[PDB]
Design a protein around this ligand. Structure first.
Ligand code: CDL
Ligand code: PLX
Lengths: 175, 122
């Protein structure tokens, strides 16, 4: 339905064929479907209608919490505990959001593999490539930090990688 | 081995210099005073138990005197202790101020410019 964003959770246009009977025999599946409909789906729908009638009477909402952007750990001087505290809390919240991004991408991948049936190896390549890009980025940022991770250790990992990349590019320029 | 015995202008046996009166006295509900009163109460109860008297009931005037004595002495103990810590901090700050070449203020770096070593956990 419209409850969730179809841009973050997309799906193809859902092509389904029309029934083309070839025999005089009655299809027991469709009769069972009519029986199921008129014994199960209608009482359940009525119950839900009443429940939502009672819901509409008392309507209240909640709001997603928004967080400002505070200075990160790079612009905190070495022993300033308050800047360090706020930077570390911000880094932790960002780590949580990145975990959820990888989760969304993995959900897409799984849904594609199930949906595409026998053709998943070709029809889910974009989902696989998207996951590969996200996984590579997430791995660079947080892998090998260990328990007792922190923004300072993430910064040290990034700086080590940046040094290696700079030196590699410099010796490639001499080639 | 004797850091504050030789301090200048110190009266031999005062226990409470006059300069100590510039400091805020401990409140009468100071939790350290309450603990001293609890110590006095435990002394009263052990007193009853040793002399084979009912432990919580026997001498109420005696237990009151125990508690009062402990609280009374603890008040002055706390005053003297807070005063001695105030002396320590006063002297330390004055010494840091008069010897600036021993306590220099060096420019501190943000973590963006300090190169820290990374150790992977694997
Ligand atoms: C960290 C968290 C907080 C911790 C708090 C601090 C620790 C506790 C406080 C310590 C001091 C307090 C008690 C000292 C005096 C006790 C002496 C005694 O004999 O007690 C008997 C006495 C009972 O005897 P009885 O009623 O006359 O009749 C009994 C029979 O006659 C028959 O009696 P009996 O004499 O013939 O029986 C003899 C008995 C007698 O044996 C004893 O009574 C042992 C007493 C040893 C005193 C401990 C030394 C000082 C305290 C140090 C605690 C150390 C803590 C750190 C870890 C170490 C663990 C010990 O010995 C034996 O039977 C042999 C057993 C041997 C087993 C080994 C255990 C021995 C050592 C265990 C020590 C455990 C800690 C103390 C536990 C509480 C004891 C009352 O105890 C009491 O009834 C009174 C206890 C406290 C009541 C007062 C409560 C305050 C008022 C109520 C209102 C609440 C206030 C808040 C208001 C709220 C708003 C509404
Ligand atoms: C197990 C706990 C220990 C109990 C200790 C016995 C407590 C009861 C003793 C009675 C208290 C009265 C003693 C002092 C009253 C007035 C005398 C006063 O003028 O003395 C001054 C000094 O004051 C006393 O020294 C303070 C005594 C306080 C002792 C309690 C501290 C215990 C440490 C932590 C345990 C908590 C105990 C809880 C209390 C029951 C003199 O200063 P000064 O002449 O220049 O120093 C001589 C020593 N020098 C030169 C080498 C430095």
């Amino acid at each position: 339905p419209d409850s969730w964003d179809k841009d973050v959770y997309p799906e193809p246009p859902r092509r389904t064929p029309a029934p083309a009977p070839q025999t005089s025999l009655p299809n027991p599946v469709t009769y069972l479907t009519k029986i199921f409909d008129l014994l199960v789906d209608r009482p359940v729908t009525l119950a839900r209608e009443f429940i939502e009638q009672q819901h509409a009477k008392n309507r209240y909402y909640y709001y997603h919490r928004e967080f400002r952007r505070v200075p990160d750990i790079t612009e905190c001087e070495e022993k300033d505990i308050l800047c360090m505290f706020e930077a570390e809390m911000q880094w932790r919240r960002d780590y949580k959001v990145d975990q959820e991004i990888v989760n969304i991408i993995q959900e897409r991948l799984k849904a594609c593999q199930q949906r595409e049936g026998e053709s998943y190896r070709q029809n889910c390549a974009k989902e696989l490539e998207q996951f590969t890009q996200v996984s590579k980025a997430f791995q660079d940022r947080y892998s090998d930090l260990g328990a007792h991770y922190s923004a300072r250790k993430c910064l040290a990992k990034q700086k080590q990688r940046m040094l290696a990349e700079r030196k590699a590019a410099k010796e490639a320029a001499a080639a | 081995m004797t850091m504050m015995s030789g301090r200048p202008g110190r009266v031999p046996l005062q226990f409470l210099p006059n300069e100590a009166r510039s400091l805020p006295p401990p409140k009468l509900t100071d939790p350290r005073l309450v603990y001293m009163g609890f110590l006095g109460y435990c002394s009263g109860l052990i007193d009853n138990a040793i002399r084979r008297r009912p432990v919580v009931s026997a001498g109420l005037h005696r237990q009151l005197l125990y508690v009062t004595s402990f609280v009374f002495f603890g008040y002055y103990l706390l005053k003297r202790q807070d005063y001695m810590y105030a002396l320590r901090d006063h002297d330390m700050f004055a010494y840091v101020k008069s010897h600036p070449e021993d306590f220099p203020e060096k420019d501190k770096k943000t973590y963006g410019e300090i190169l820290e070593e990374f150790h992977p956990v694997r």
